[PDB]
Amino acid sequence: PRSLKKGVFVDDHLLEKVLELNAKGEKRLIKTWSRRSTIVPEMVGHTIAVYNGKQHVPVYITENMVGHKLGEFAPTRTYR
Amino acid sequence: ARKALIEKAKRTPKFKVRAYTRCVRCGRARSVYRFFGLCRICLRELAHKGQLPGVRKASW
């Protein structure tokens, strides 16, 4: 767990922030933007704002679901 | 006359992801191939005139 990918790739755009900041711990949601990522390792258990198109909902990630193409962790429509 | 967007050339791809195609004549970034770099129209029409080198009408 979570590696799999290594290092916890995040398309730099989200990787740079993920790293080092992972130092003083968290503070949560860092309103992510290029979810083109393939979330990974350390990304296990944190909060970031997933641009659902017009909003920055706050997402919290967990173990076995961390590393996967960022996008699909924040919905983007609204039917029924 | 869409002046405010004649930024297409400052390129600043700033992540290749943005610099975008276009028609040199009638702007229109819609259908703007290359060798011509025109809107199917600015294009085809000025061609029509013909002051657009050699290229000639089709037949067959």
């Binding site: 967990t62 076995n64 679901m65 962790f73 924040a74 039917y79 | -």
Partner: protein, 114 residues
């Protein structure tokens, strides 16, 4: 030959056998017919245990499929369905996970016309 889900292969080669089992058939019959080592030409009606046991055995730990296919399919689909992921999102309702577009055309999962 009685294997896992009693997927007995009739007048068909080995490959044509497994394909008759859970998550088997195309692509699956090839791998099975290769290991078990048998002429895909065989009609399947005399698979001597002496040879069936060989492929039948190794076809347990690393193969399932059978009363296990759901595992990697049920367990692997339980995670994404528990996290704010996306892979399971498309399934968070009844549309098409793979694609697709929604709104119009997608009864394949949604259900029947309404």
């Amino acid at each position: 030959a009685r294997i896992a889900g009693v997927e007995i292969p009739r007048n068909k080669r080995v490959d044509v056998a497994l394909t008759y089992i859970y998550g088997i058939g195309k692509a699956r019959a090839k791998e099975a017919l290769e290991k078990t080592g048998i002429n895909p030409a065989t009609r399947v009606k005399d698979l001597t245990e002496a040879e069936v046991v060989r492929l039948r055995e190794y076809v347990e730990n690393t193969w399932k499929l059978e009363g296990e296919l759901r595992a990697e399919v049920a367990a692997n689909i339980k995670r994404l369905m528990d996290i704010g992921c996306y892979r399971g999102l498309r399934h968070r309702r009844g549309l098409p996970v793979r694609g697709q577009r929604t709104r119009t055309n997608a009864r394949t999962r949604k259900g029947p016309r309404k």
